[PDB]
Amino acid sequence: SWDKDVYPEPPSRTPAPSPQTSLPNPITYLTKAYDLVVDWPVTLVREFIERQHAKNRTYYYHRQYRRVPDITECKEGDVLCIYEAEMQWRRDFKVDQEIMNIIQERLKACQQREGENYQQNCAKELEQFTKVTKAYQDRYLDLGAYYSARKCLAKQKQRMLEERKAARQE
Amino acid sequence: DGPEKNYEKTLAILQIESEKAELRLKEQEVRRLMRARGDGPWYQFPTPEKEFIDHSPKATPDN
């Protein structure tokens, strides 16, 4: 299973078979024999396993990371507070890599299924990619290899100033 | 162990390394002032021992 909201998937619409030839579809036969000889024995092996995994049911949790003071709340030089603001940002920055991948999975998953209509029926997924990319580029692009929170902050302040100077004229 | 230990040790290390860094910069500022002004316990340079001045009455009065 998986969450169908994280990974949206249009319902399948298979036309019902319309066989108007006298001959037998050889696909539909090896599909029966495949179910009896391959699918059926395997499902027993899996049902056996999941009855063991039910007897030894174990649990694990997603770790919670409360929020710590931002970098903006750190006096210059106080490495004790910079360190925690830096660790948090690195955690945040990493979750943003995986958000981008998820948005990319959708766009790739849509391109395949729409097939010859991707130029039309993949607009919404291409729009989220185009939007979530602009945000990503506005946060993390050009930081460099030694990227950190302080550089992320410096890049934002330099951009908030270049836009304030847009209206200071207009 | 959990992440706590490595995290809070790294906090403990960073504090030690940070306090040391400020002491080292403070010693240079201190040594610069004591040496140039001679008003501190360091860089005291010798002056003649006054205990060997002869305080007795002399053969002459004007002394």
Swiss-Prot record, chain A:
Residue ranges, annotated region (Disordered): 1-24
Compartment(s) where it occurs, according to its Swiss-Prot or TrEMBL record: Mitochondrion inner membrane
Modified residues (Phosphoserine): 18, 148
Any one GO cellular component localisation term in the record: respiratory chain complex I
GO-annotated biological processes: aerobic respiration; proton motive force-driven mitochondrial ATP synthesis
Bilayer topology annotation: Peripheral membrane protein
Keywords, alphabetical: Electron transport, Membrane, Mitochondrion, Mitochondrion inner membrane, Phosphoprotein, Respiratory chain, Transport
Major place of residence: mitochondrion
Source organism, top-level taxon: Eukaryota
Pfam entry (one): NDUFB10
Basic and acidic residues compositional bias, start-end: 1-7
Extent of Pro residues compositional bias: 8-18
InterPro entries: NADH_UbQ_OxRdtase_su10, NDUFB10
Function: Accessory subunit that is involved in the functional assembly of the mitochondrial respiratory chain complex I. Complex I has an NADH dehydrogenase activity with ubiquinone as an immediate electron acceptor and mediates the transfer of electrons from NADH to the respiratory chain. Accessory subunit of the mitochondrial membrane respiratory chain NADH dehydrogenase (Complex I), that is believed not to be involved in catalysis. Complex I functions in the transfer of electrons from NADH to the respiratory chain. The immediate electron acceptor for the enzyme is believed to be ubiquinone.
Assembly, per entry: Complex I is composed of 45 different subunits. Interacts with CHCHD4.
UniProt record similarity statement: Belongs to the complex I NDUFB10 subunit family.
Name of the protein in its database record: NADH dehydrogenase [ubiquinone] 1 beta subcomplex subunit 10
Species name: Mus musculus
Gene: Ndufb10
Swiss-Prot record, chain B:
Subcellular location: Mitochondrion inner membrane
Domain of life of the source: Eukaryota
Purpose: Accessory subunit of the mitochondrial membrane respiratory chain NADH dehydrogenase (Complex I), that is believed not to be involved in catalysis. Complex I functions in the transfer of electrons from NADH to the respiratory chain. The immediate electron acceptor for the enzyme is believed to be ubiquinone.
Similarity comment: family membership: Belongs to the complex I NDUFB5 subunit family.
Quaternary assembly: Complex I is composed of 45 different subunits.
Protein name (database record): NADH dehydrogenase [ubiquinone] 1 beta subcomplex subunit 5, mitochondrial
